[PDB]
Design a protein around this nucleic acid. Structure first.
Lengths: 142, 129, 150
RNA sequence: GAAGUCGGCAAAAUGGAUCCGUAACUUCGGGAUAAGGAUUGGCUCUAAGGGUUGGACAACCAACUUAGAACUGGUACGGACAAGGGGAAUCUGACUGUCUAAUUAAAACAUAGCAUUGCGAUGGCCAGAAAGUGGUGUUGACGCAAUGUGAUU
RNA sequence: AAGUUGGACAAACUUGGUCAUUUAGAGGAAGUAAAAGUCGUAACAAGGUUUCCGUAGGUGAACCUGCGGAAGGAUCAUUA
RNA sequence: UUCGAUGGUAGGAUAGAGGCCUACCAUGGUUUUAACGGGUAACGGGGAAUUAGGGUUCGAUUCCGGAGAGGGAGCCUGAGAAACGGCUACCACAUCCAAGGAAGGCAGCAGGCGCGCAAAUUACCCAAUCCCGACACGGGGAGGUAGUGACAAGAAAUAACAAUGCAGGGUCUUGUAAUUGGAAUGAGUACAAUGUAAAUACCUUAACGAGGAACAAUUGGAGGGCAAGUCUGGUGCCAGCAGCCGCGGUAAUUCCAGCUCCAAUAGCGUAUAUUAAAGUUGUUGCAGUUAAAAAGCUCGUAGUUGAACUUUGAGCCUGGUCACCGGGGUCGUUAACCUUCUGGCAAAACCAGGACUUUUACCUUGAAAAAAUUAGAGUGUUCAAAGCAGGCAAGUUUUGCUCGAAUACAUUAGCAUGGAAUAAUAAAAUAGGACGUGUGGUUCUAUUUUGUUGGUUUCUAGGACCGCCGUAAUGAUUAAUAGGGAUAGUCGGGGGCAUUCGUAUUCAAUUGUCAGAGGUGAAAUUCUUGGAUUUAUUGAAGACGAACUACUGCGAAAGCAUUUGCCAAGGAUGUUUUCAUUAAUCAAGAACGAAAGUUAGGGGAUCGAAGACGAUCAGAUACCGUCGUAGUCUUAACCAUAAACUAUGCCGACUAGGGAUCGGGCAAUGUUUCUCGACUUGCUCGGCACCUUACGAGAAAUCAAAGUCUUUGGGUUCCGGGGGGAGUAUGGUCGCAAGGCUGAAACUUAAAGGAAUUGACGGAAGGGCACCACAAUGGAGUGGAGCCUGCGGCUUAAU
């Protein structure tokens, strides 16, 4: 098994360092995937420019239209997808609305039955969510 | 090749105790083994043992009186300071009143409690309880 | 375990607990020394002569009577071989295998055995060089292995 | 600065030596002087590299190189002469070699390699009008004779 | 004092090459999420030619066959 | 390594050392203990977060050190600058312009644009801290004070006092109260006194100051994890939820609306980075037979690990706290502080003092060393986060006194004291040794005197060296159920070379004969009245060693099976044989390495990739039959993999019962055989294995190892971190090539996988049972012609 000598620290350290790359967590954290390959740069939130709206089909055993939106990030111009939490707000969220996006919870993995979605809308046009659904605050003029 | 005769002696003793045999034969013999056997015999875990003296490293026959749950060696022999005794007792010993850790300090081979009284650390040899 | 084999044989010799010559064996500790010197003058192996005193002469382990080993006695008397016995025997075996290999070109098993002997002879030579029984510059030679054996 | 022309035909440009540097590909042998850069005169010195020879040495005689420095002038110096233009691809022939003397030098022929065929001498192949005749053959299948393809992979 | 001859520090500019990153790029070859269809066991049973590994050839498709191995076999078994 | 990289000489320059630079001379310096290069989404540290221990992440940020003022470069002043709120030149920006020109740098304090998910006043003051200056007085966007914010931390306001029918409970006690009255009222409104440079805020404080809109506390959830709905209306696998499972196709506890409750509370939720979980990075502390993973085997270097033994036993006292313990030592056995120098003593050493590690690791302790931080001592910011202040004294309101402002963390690394257990190198082997008021001598220095200075001699004090001189017991650890080397009888389908035999297959000649021969489940193709198949003789070719052939042997593995001879070698056994630690493991590095594949030569009988034909099903294209290419054989060169398996690395120790089996040895007044062999029995060592059991292990199958592991540590290499993508692309490297070695990322998925159990299925097997099954010579029939009745198609309006 593992060496158990009083002067085997170099062997133990070298083996631990070499095998540490096997773990997905260590590999991700040290390869900088959260900045290079990720749509963000490690940011918790970001702003984007809306492109269009997509009714992505739901995988088995479900089948639904989730009124997601295709957005273009302001800082990079790349095209990604976003999810609208509130119901029936598709008419409220239009294109080129200067939307605000955040993560979903799995740190870069698809949610539920909809493949290709990792970001959700937190604020839209600067008015935010949770207000246009209860009619507490209306959208501003543009 | 035999790397440490103390490990073989303690493994033979614990194996015989698990089997229930009242006597055990240890080959070969060394001063470290004799000192370790003296420590556990003084603490009451080991009955009389006789050293057969041939023209070789020697052999030991030990009378086992039970009351031993496990005796083992700690390899490699880490250097143990005064403040490390508490950590070793927590890691190895069943409790703070049961079990003995044997250290080869500057003043000789003795138990952890006696070494703590001597106010001198050393290297950890093994444990028994 | 065997150095270069999977065997685990334990065959050896058990020296007696006594360290004294037998009662009738009045070897007088000097006639044996003269016999050893005569047996070494021809050039027989120290192990082989020790066998001869054990079997033909009836002498016990020579140390128990003479007080010194066979190698030590002849070294003190000056009849010391240039190379150690085990060193010389291994070089002899290595030389014989190489002489067989240069003739039989299709013996891969013998080539493997030669490689094992070369590893053994080098490790023994390194030990003897460290212990100082040989001059520090004792690089073993494959071409002049015939020189080293003889 | 090739806009000429079917076409860079012709000419120009490069060129010696020393010091840097040199890609794709490859049969690992090359490509390669690849490509791309710098220097070069004269004079005055410096250092190192070898021979015999009078009592650690030594005054000669008899010698050629290399490297470096300063100074100087037409910022010039292989000063005439001498003397590679280079690169990226396609078709084709492997290469060296050979031929239409006097219009065609090639992709044509040949080549090593590969493969096939006949023949064990009372024979195969060839020759002779005939021959008591000749060649292969001062030969014997690792040979001779007859063909096709044309390096390597 | 301006100016001038030499020495070094030398910013910065042209010409080329090398390195890291990015943006191109028609088009070619991959798998993953995949509209009906397509498709027979190649494998799961003796999956209907027992299975599988290495190697080579052939075949629209899993694949078929030759050689040597393993049972992870469907046999731990023929002492007469 | 030029145009300085390593060192030397000399010089220059620097405040000074220095290849800092220059000229010359040699080729040196670092590196698998990772040099060099690359990335850093890297200023470093005190420190911060998580908190059994060990560990992991962060440190832009109140302190210390470093660099910088858009980017380099150069310089003056000045002790001190390569200064930029100093200058000069160039580049990129921006700038007034009479187009001649001047020219500028907020990563300083406020403030502005832009990038942004993300961060505040173009406020007041030198009063406190300190700094500068010619200076008791000046200045300080250092610094202090205030202003806006959703968050970084610490303390509590949204109230409680009763009557109230009833649920009640027990004449004692809570509840909603479509209800009221008296109570305690604190924020605010506003002049006071404190506070402050002046103000804000704070403590005191003119007075006013709640009855329901009182002066309405919200954020998520109520299927589980994880707490709280089969309560009511609307949609109805849709809208949608949904971190995961999962719900939604009219009874929706999960969708959206009402109600209630649940966790938290001026806070709740969401996203991201990290920590614990994660014993899923395992040193503590993982796993490798079957789930991911032991390399095909062997050698072996760095590296790691390394058998036992060298001052020990006994008798003492002693001052000391819990009859113990820590410590100090001789006395002497066994020698008493080895030794160097010194003081006195002087028949040297005897006593004491200075140094005593050869050289350590290790342990203890000490010195030395920032504060802030952490733990923590003391102290009543009304408690607390705080702070380092404070306290007396309640009868004179006392020309004062009294405490503190600790302690630890330090050792990574360095210095030093004490100990010599554990682990390391040497001591005197060709004695090339302590040898020493030492038998003889050399050679030098004057630490001194001979007159102060300079020089030789040498009495003298001392360093060093030459042949001897026996002062003494003169010097070598046992020889490991470690290892190597001998030596004897052996043993082996271990290796190579030559060599002998065997029948089988195919082919050739000839001979006897004629109808079919081959082949398959059935065929078909092909050949055969020309002599097929068969049978008899002879010869040739190459391949291969059947039966004996076994839960038997050998070899490191791949593999090795005819005889004999030669050569080299190997294990086990026997051994009062020799050396003495010479050993285990391996990164790298090399030898061997089935079959198939490659290059050529020789050889090519059978089989047989590719291929050729004929049934076969619908299609066969594949299985089947015959022929047949490369290949199967050998020689000389290649490669380098397989289910290369015991799916199980190597060395060492221990662990239960039996019977077979190979090799060796020991014993038998046991059997047998023309001096030994064969058989049998017992013991032991070394192998291949088998049966039972499970103290023990595992998830189980199972395992004498896969046991001696939560009671986790004998030593050492290789390898894995969910499945795909993918052993794929790219890169490097070996090979002529096929290919071998090394070997990712993006993206996607909530699961793949192992063991075992129960059903189901099997063109699987074994027992059977049946006229809705067959056999039976079956009997009757339907279906064949025509009609009753019912079913689909058609018609209609309903059929």
């Amino acid at each position: 098994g593992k060496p158990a000598g009083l002067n085997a620290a170099r062997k133990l350290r070298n083996h631990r360092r070499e095998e540490r790359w096997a773990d997905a967590h260590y590999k991700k954290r040290l390869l900088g995937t959260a900045y290079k390959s990720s749509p963000f740069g490690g940011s918790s939130h970001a702003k984007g420019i809306v492109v269009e709206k997509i009714g992505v089909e739901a995988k088995q055993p479900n089948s639904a239209i989730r009124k997601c939106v295709r957005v273009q990030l302001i800082k990079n111009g790349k095209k990604v997808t976003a999810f609208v939490p509130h119901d029936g707000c598709l008419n409220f969220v239009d294109e080129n609305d200067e939307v605000l996006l955040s993560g979903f919870g799995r740190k870069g993995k698809a949610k539920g039955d909809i493949p290709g979605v990792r970001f959700k809308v937190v604020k839209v046009a600067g008015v935010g969510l949770s207000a246009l659904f209860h009619e507490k605050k209306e959208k501003p003029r543009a | 090749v035999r790397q440490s005769v103390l490990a073989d002696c303690l493994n033979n003793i614990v194996n015989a105790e698990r089997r229930g045999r009242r006597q055990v034969l240890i080959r070969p013999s060394s001063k470290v083994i004799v000192k370790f056997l003296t420590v556990m015999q003084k603490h009451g875990y080991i009955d009389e043992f006789t050293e057969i003296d041939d023209h070789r490293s020697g052999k030991i026959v030990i009378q086992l009186n039970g009351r031993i749950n496990k005796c083992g060696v700690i390899s490699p022999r880490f250097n143990v300071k005064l403040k490390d005794i508490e950590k070793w007792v927590n890691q190895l010993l069943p409790s703070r009143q049961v079990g003995v850790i044997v250290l080869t300090t500057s003043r000789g081979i003795m138990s952890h409690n006696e070494a703590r009284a001597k106010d001198a650390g050393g290297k950890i040899l093994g444990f028994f309880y | 375990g065997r150095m270069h084999s999977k065997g685990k044989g334990i065959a050896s010799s058990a020296l007696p607990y006594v360290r004294s010559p037998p009662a009738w064996c009045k070897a007088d500790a000097d006639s044996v020394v003269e016999q050893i010197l005569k047996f070494s003058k021809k050039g027989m192996s120290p192990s082989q002569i020790g066998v001869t005193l054990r079997d033909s002469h009836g002498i016990p382990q020579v140390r128990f009577i003479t007080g010194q080993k066979i190698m030590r006695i002849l070294k003190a008397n000056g009849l010391a071989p240039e190379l150690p016995e085990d060193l010389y025997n291994l070089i002899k075996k290595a030389v014989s295998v190489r002489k067989h290999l240069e003739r039989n070109r299709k013996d891969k098993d013998s080539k493997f055995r030669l490689i094992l002997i070369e590893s053994r002879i080098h490790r023994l030579a390194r030990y003897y060089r460290k212990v100082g029984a040989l001059p520090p510059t004792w690089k073993y030679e494959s071409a002049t292995a015939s020189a080293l054996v003889a």
